[PDB]
Design a protein around this motif. Structure first.
Motif, PDB file in Angstrom:
ATOM      1  N   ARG A  19      -2.048 -70.160 -10.111  1.00 39.81           N
ATOM      2  CA  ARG A  19      -1.911 -70.644  -8.734  1.00 39.81           C
ATOM      3  C   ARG A  19      -0.525 -70.328  -8.188  1.00 39.81           C
ATOM      4  O   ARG A  19      -0.415 -69.802  -7.079  1.00 39.81           O
ATOM      5  CB  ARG A  19      -2.226 -72.136  -8.659  1.00 39.81           C
ATOM      6  N   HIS A  20       0.522 -70.568  -8.979  1.00 39.11           N
ATOM      7  CA  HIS A  20       1.874 -70.205  -8.568  1.00 39.11           C
ATOM      8  C   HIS A  20       2.067 -68.695  -8.446  1.00 39.11           C
ATOM      9  O   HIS A  20       2.742 -68.244  -7.521  1.00 39.11           O
ATOM     10  CB  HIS A  20       2.952 -70.853  -9.451  1.00 39.11           C
ATOM     11  N   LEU A  21       1.453 -67.935  -9.353  1.00 34.03           N
ATOM     12  CA  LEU A  21       1.505 -66.478  -9.339  1.00 34.03           C
ATOM     13  C   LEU A  21       0.866 -65.929  -8.062  1.00 34.03           C
ATOM     14  O   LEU A  21       1.440 -65.045  -7.422  1.00 34.03           O
ATOM     15  CB  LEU A  21       0.850 -65.883 -10.611  1.00 34.03           C
ATOM     16  N   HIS A  22      -0.282 -66.468  -7.662  1.00 32.42           N
ATOM     17  CA  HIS A  22      -0.946 -66.019  -6.436  1.00 32.42           C
ATOM     18  C   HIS A  22      -0.347 -66.585  -5.140  1.00 32.42           C
ATOM     19  O   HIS A  22      -0.013 -65.831  -4.236  1.00 32.42           O
ATOM     20  CB  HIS A  22      -2.475 -66.267  -6.466  1.00 32.42           C
ATOM     21  N   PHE A  23      -0.278 -67.909  -5.034  1.00 37.29           N
ATOM     22  CA  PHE A  23       0.098 -68.558  -3.771  1.00 37.29           C
ATOM     23  C   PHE A  23       1.615 -68.693  -3.544  1.00 37.29           C
ATOM     24  O   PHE A  23       2.037 -68.553  -2.427  1.00 37.29           O
ATOM     25  CB  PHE A  23      -0.622 -69.886  -3.624  1.00 37.29           C
ATOM     26  N   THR A  24       2.411 -68.915  -4.594  1.00 39.14           N
ATOM     27  CA  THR A  24       3.857 -69.035  -4.466  1.00 39.14           C
ATOM     28  C   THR A  24       4.475 -67.639  -4.527  1.00 39.14           C
ATOM     29  O   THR A  24       5.233 -67.282  -3.636  1.00 39.14           O
ATOM     30  CB  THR A  24       4.456 -69.953  -5.564  1.00 39.14           C
ATOM     31  N   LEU A  25       4.180 -66.855  -5.571  1.00 41.84           N
ATOM     32  CA  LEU A  25       4.865 -65.553  -5.785  1.00 41.84           C
ATOM     33  C   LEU A  25       4.237 -64.446  -4.920  1.00 41.84           C
ATOM     34  O   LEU A  25       4.903 -63.442  -4.645  1.00 41.84           O
ATOM     35  CB  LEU A  25       4.865 -65.135  -7.272  1.00 41.84           C
ATOM     36  N   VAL A  26       2.982 -64.652  -4.506  1.00 39.03           N
ATOM     37  CA  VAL A  26       2.146 -63.689  -3.756  1.00 39.03           C
ATOM     38  C   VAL A  26       2.092 -62.360  -4.524  1.00 39.03           C
ATOM     39  O   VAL A  26       2.482 -61.289  -4.037  1.00 39.03           O
ATOM     40  CB  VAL A  26       2.523 -63.602  -2.253  1.00 39.03           C
ATOM     41  N   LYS A  27       1.620 -62.500  -5.766  1.00 39.11           N
ATOM     42  CA  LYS A  27       1.477 -61.417  -6.752  1.00 39.11           C
ATOM     43  C   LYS A  27       0.144 -61.562  -7.488  1.00 39.11           C
ATOM     44  O   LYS A  27      -0.563 -62.581  -7.343  1.00 39.11           O
ATOM     45  CB  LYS A  27       2.641 -61.466  -7.749  1.00 39.11           C
ATOM     46  N   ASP A  28      -0.210 -60.512  -8.213  1.00 36.16           N
ATOM     47  CA  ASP A  28      -1.321 -60.510  -9.212  1.00 36.16           C
ATOM     48  C   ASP A  28      -0.712 -59.970 -10.516  1.00 36.16           C
ATOM     49  O   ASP A  28       0.462 -59.502 -10.518  1.00 36.16           O
ATOM     50  CB  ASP A  28      -2.569 -59.711  -8.716  1.00 36.16           C
ATOM     51  N   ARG A  29      -1.483 -60.030 -11.594  1.00 36.08           N
ATOM     52  CA  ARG A  29      -1.043 -59.602 -12.941  1.00 36.08           C
ATOM     53  C   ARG A  29      -0.736 -58.122 -13.097  1.00 36.08           C
ATOM     54  O   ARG A  29      -0.005 -57.747 -14.016  1.00 36.08           O
ATOM     55  CB  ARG A  29      -2.088 -59.989 -13.961  1.00 36.08           C
ATOM     56  N   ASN A  30      -1.229 -57.290 -12.184  1.00 39.48           N
ATOM     57  CA  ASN A  30      -0.882 -55.867 -12.197  1.00 39.48           C
ATOM     58  C   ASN A  30       0.486 -55.533 -11.667  1.00 39.48           C
ATOM     59  O   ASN A  30       1.107 -54.582 -12.160  1.00 39.48           O
ATOM     60  CB  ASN A  30      -1.964 -55.049 -11.484  1.00 39.48           C
ATOM     61  N   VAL A  31       0.948 -56.301 -10.680  1.00 37.08           N
ATOM     62  CA  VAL A  31       2.255 -56.031 -10.043  1.00 37.08           C
ATOM     63  C   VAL A  31       3.349 -56.953 -10.571  1.00 37.08           C
ATOM     64  O   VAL A  31       4.511 -56.686 -10.341  1.00 37.08           O
ATOM     65  CB  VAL A  31       2.190 -56.032  -8.481  1.00 37.08           C
ATOM     66  N   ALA A  32       2.983 -58.012 -11.292  1.00 38.59           N
ATOM     67  CA  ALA A  32       3.951 -58.986 -11.793  1.00 38.59           C
ATOM     68  C   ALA A  32       4.816 -58.464 -12.947  1.00 38.59           C
ATOM     69  O   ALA A  32       4.342 -57.767 -13.869  1.00 38.59           O
ATOM     70  CB  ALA A  32       3.233 -60.265 -12.199  1.00 38.59           C
ATOM     71  N   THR A  33       6.085 -58.843 -12.882  1.00 35.79           N
ATOM     72  CA  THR A  33       7.093 -58.530 -13.885  1.00 35.79           C
ATOM     73  C   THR A  33       7.208 -59.745 -14.800  1.00 35.79           C
ATOM     74  O   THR A  33       6.747 -60.829 -14.428  1.00 35.79           O
ATOM     75  CB  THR A  33       8.469 -58.327 -13.206  1.00 35.79           C
TER      76      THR A  33
END
Ligand SMILES: *Cc1c(COP(=O)(O)O)cnc(C)c1O
Lengths: 807, 157, 157
Positions: free
Chosen positions: A13-27
């Motif tokens: 939820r934090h990865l999507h809504f807070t960081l505005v990322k998905d697992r492909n672009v996340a560091t």
């Protein structure tokens, strides 16, 4: 567990809504943030409830003012104080990540520097654990102090860009911003004193949660960022504005700046925290649920001055009360003295902070007036009690005469505080009888002792879970909040099972730190070798050089008789040198130069390794302290007030080699001096050597192992390409050594031999360790804080009980 | 100028040129450029030092009389001056500062300022470059003047 | 923000980001350098633009939702930031000014300042260079990627 599923759901939820990322672009950094947010959400519920509770029940508030907060990393502490460590470890594993990898992406908060800052952080953790209504106030330093790098064996200062990617823990409160005034002029009008034509810097608050251990309290650390107010202008007025903007913002740039009116910047920093904080304390006081009115102020407010840095609190509280709140001078003063308390950390009166009065004439003309009025009324009192004593008046005055008039900020703190404490029993006696002798004669009851401490959560439960469990199995969990319960470990010195368990924990810790060592420094670490650790500020008085001479002596001993059975050592020396301290930078270079020779000598092999631990910080202390066998606490006797590193090694299973000064004294007294490797000159012996006169040449001449070691350093054996590299080290040790390195070498060598003979017997080594750990309970910051609370603040711990929150 | 105030040394500015120096003669016509900074380029026509900041060296000559002979020699002392003059707000401030940093080359002896060490180096080069250009100009401007082979016979530094 | 005071127009500063913008997401990780000034050198390995001042373009993304469809596009807006860091008194002031002149690229729309015309040109290049580097980076970072021949088929500017 339903907990593991919740963390997993919150992370995504934090990865999507807070960081505005998905697992492909996340560091990995995005993953650290996503987790840090997940975990912070668990604090927020308690944080809101805690502040709702203090507003409802209006308790007396504790304000701890410090220019340093050596906080370290927050993720692990937060997880453990909420009990979510195991659930996060599993959730992160199931997500395809590694918790410890994510833990390493977090930046050490660039908010502290050394002992004074770490003391503040341990205190904040204790105050929250004890349920006090405590607020830490300081500066939000954007670039810390500096990250130490070792390039070609020398220290290089790299900028600590710790806020580059943001801090997930803090909340910006731009709405609670306050103005700070500088310069201007002062006008006495019929409606009271007015401070006019001032430059204004804005103090923007950022709040950080400070969670209590296994209670529902989450307190606040409030850190101020300097910002210029925005906006007519000619070419010159435009440049003046851009510069004032920059000079405003560099108030919260770095800790202890150098810049030589970068001294004016230090004074600005000091006032910036004082004015910001005091306006906030007052605003909170009058904005209480249901609020002449200032008579209850000393019953609802305690301001603790961690050193003289926040000393301006005295005349600034006086300023706000008298010039803004229209309180009568005398009443405001009796209120001031009862709200403020001062903690001193230094020995000898020349280390105490002074500012030229001319600097105050320009930067703070109204505070100068107030200081002058406080001083006059104080000297009238002294003149009444001791008539005709003209030299007593000069000694006791806050203003000193010389090449220019100066304001002694320590004297101002003594006069404006109801309590004054030192940080160890004998240091506090020196504070009383020597530093402020005349003040002690007039008011003995003002002067106290508050022996320093360390937090058992960070400095045990976090950095050493292995040891924590082995203690938990035998005496339960209660020691983590009542550390004196470790005395129940005393009978277990006979228990063969416990001894082999404590030793197993140490070796596990040693192996984990070897893995960090081999990966980062590329030296072959011997696992059966003794971890000899000396981590602190690089300074002549701390005597890393004394440790260097021991290492060279050992190198020479292996070379003379390479067949001989030798106790293997990994000698680790760490610490930061002040950027302008020529001798301390030479010393770092000596350590790396020694290591280059020692670690690459094939005759030496796995018997001796020397490493300079790069960038000693809070987070690194937590790796190295649990892995240490021996703790070097070898400062010249009479130089150390307390020390808290001492305490950290004692709790984590290390034996101590040290002099009879600072914390070592109370550590000896707690565990019995026979369980510690005390050596060398005693305070009184140091004094007696100054009466004889120290002639270091006599030592060099008649100690062959030392003469060989010094000659190698001097001739360039450790520096073949630049043989005069350590000339200033040698010149100092022979002619200007105030810290008596040679005078303590023989005693130190003999003492290290006793260390060598004890390590040769594993069981008796670990028996002595158990005796140290069992008697360390006194050095809990819970004990220190309970002491401050009852003997200074007039608050009782656990009188405030925060109930479970609502989501 | 040292002053003793309340038994301590105070440093007062030595404004010795306030009212002028009657002994010296300004030679603004014999001014020479001094180059700083820039970059260096190796070209087929030889090494070139490009994109340099320029400070002007203005000479002032003072007579040095011989005792009971007819010789009066010269002391040649150089004053730092910025060349005068497009600009944005920042370029204007850069120019005013470079003007000031140029002129403080010949402000005080042994300045402190801690890259006031850079100012010492600038001072050192300013006298060197000014002087050497003047020595060479004098050498080749001789009455009736490959040609540098006689230089060590006509010049001692 | 226009205000009418005594029947005349007064210009008040539009502090619209004072309390923050809830719609936008900062992408400090997708920042790109913008080059200014410098000089150009023709080398055997191609043309090189050297000794440039660098301003950083920090992207902020804002959602652009489609009406009763599932498309949410991006508005990508760049904030000017100076790169951080040796210095003498003059070098320090040069740095503070260049920092300010960098940040005033994204201060106000259609600035006046009279080389505030140079500021307009800087603004124009700042969006161009930031954007084109981003377009290209997106093009070559496609799932499965001489190669520029398809560029006019995958990109319209
Ligand atoms: C505990 C600690 C200190 C204090 O060490 P002393 O020499 O005892 O003052 C300093 N730095 C760090 C990183 C610490 O954790």
């Amino acid at each position: 567990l339903g907990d593991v599923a919740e963390v997993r759901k919150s992370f995504n939820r934090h990865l999507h809504f807070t960081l505005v990322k998905d697992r492909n672009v996340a560091t990995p950094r995005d993953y650290f943030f996503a987790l840090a947010h997940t975990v912070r959400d668990h604090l927020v519920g308690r944080w809101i409830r805690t502040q709702q509770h203090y507003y409802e029940r209006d308790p007396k508030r504790i304000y701890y003012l410090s220019l340093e907060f050596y906080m370290g990393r927050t993720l692990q502490n937060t997880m453990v104080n909420l009990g979510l460590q195991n659930a996060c470890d599993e959730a992160i594993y199931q997500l395809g990540l590694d918790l410890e990898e994510l833990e390493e992406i977090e930046e050490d908060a660039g908010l502290g520097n050394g002992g004074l800052g770490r003391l503040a952080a341990c205190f904040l953790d204790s105050m929250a654990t004890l349920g006090l209504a405590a607020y830490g106030y300081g500066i939000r330093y954007e670039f810390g102090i500096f990250n130490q790098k070792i390039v070609n064996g020398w220290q290089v200062e790299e900028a600590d860009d710790w806020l580059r990617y943001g801090n997930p823990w803090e909340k910006a409160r731009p709405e609670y911003m306050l103005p700070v005034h500088f310069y201007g002029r002062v006008e006495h009008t019929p409606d009271g004193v007015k401070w006019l034509d001032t430059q204004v810097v804005l103090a923007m608050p950022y709040d950080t949660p400070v969670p209590g251990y296994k209670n529902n309290t989450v307190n606040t650390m409030r850190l101020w960022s300097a910002k210029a107010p925005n906006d007519d202008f000619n070419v010159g007025d435009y440049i003046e504005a851009v510069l004032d903007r920059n000079l405003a913002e560099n108030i919260s740039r770095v800790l202890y700046p150098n810049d030589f009116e970068g001294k004016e910047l230090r004074l600005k920093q000091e006032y910036f925290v004082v004015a910001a904080t005091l306006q906030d304390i007052i605003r909170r006081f009058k904005s209480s649920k249901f609020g002449t009115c200032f008579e209850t102020f000393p019953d609802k407010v305690a301001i603790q001055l961690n050193d003289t840095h926040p000393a301006l609190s005295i005349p600034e509280l006086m300023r706000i009360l008298v010039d803004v709140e229209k309180v009568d001078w005398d009443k405001a003063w009796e209120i001031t003295k009862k709200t403020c308390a001062y903690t001193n950390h230094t020995v000898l009166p020349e280390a105490l902070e002074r500012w030229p009065v001319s600097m105050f004439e320009k930067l703070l003309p109204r505070h100068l007036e107030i200081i002058y009025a406080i001083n006059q009324r104080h000297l009238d009192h002294v003149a009444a009690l001791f008539p005709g004593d003209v030299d007593r008046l000069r000694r006791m005055s806050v203003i000193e005469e010389g090449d220019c008039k100066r304001i002694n900020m320590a004297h101002l703190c003594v006069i404006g505080s109801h309590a004054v404490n030192g940080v160890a029993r004998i240091h506090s006696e020196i504070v009383k009888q020597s530093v402020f002798k005349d003040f002690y004669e007039l008011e003995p009851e003002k002067f106290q002792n508050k022996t320093n401490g360390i937090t058992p959560r960070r400095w045990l439960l976090l950095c050493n879970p292995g040891l924590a469990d082995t203690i938990v199995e035998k005496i339960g969990e209660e020691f983590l909040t009542d550390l004196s319960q470790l005395k129940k470990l005393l009978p277990l010195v006979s228990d063969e099972v416990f001894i082999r368990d404590v030793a197993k924990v140490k070796q596990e810790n040693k192996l984990k730190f070897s893995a960090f060592l081999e990966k980062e420094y590329k030296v072959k670490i011997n696992p059966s070798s003794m971890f000899d650790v000396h981590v602190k500020r690089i300074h002549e008085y701390k005597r890393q050089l004394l440790n260097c001479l021991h290492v060279v002596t050992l190198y020479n001993r292996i070379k003379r008789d390479p067949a001989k059975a030798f106790v293997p050592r990994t000698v680790m020396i760490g610490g930061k040198a002040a950027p302008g301290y020529h001798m301390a930078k030479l010393i770092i270079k000596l350590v790396t130069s020694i290591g280059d020779v020692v670690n690459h000598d094939p005759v030496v092999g796995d018997r001796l390794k020397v490493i300079f631990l790069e960038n000693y910080r809070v987070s690194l202390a937590e790796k190295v302290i649990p892995a240490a066998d021996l703790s070097q606490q070898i400062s010249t006797a009479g130089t150390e007030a307390s020390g808290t590193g001492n305490m950290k090694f004692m709790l984590n299973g290390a034996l101590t080699i040290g002099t009879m000064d600072g914390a070592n004294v109370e550590m000896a007294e707690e565990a019995g001096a026979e369980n510690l490797f005390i050596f060398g000159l005693r305070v009184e012996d140091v004094e007696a050597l100054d009466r004889k006169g120290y002639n270091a040449r006599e030592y060099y001449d008649h100690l062959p192992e030392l003469k060989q070691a010094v000659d190698q350093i001097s001739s360039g054996f450790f520096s073949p390409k630049e043989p005069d590299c350590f000339k200033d080290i040698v010149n100092m040790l022979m002619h200007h050594d105030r810290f008596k390195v040679f005078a303590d070498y023989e005693a130190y060598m003999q003492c290290q031999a006793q260390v060598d003979q004890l390590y040769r017997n594993p069981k008796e080594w670990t028996k002595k360790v158990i005796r140290n750990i069992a008697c360390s309970g006194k050095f809990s910051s819970d004990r220190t804080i309970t002491e401050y609370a009852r003997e200074i603040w007039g608050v009782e711990p656990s009188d405030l009980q925060i109930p479970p929150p609502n989501i």
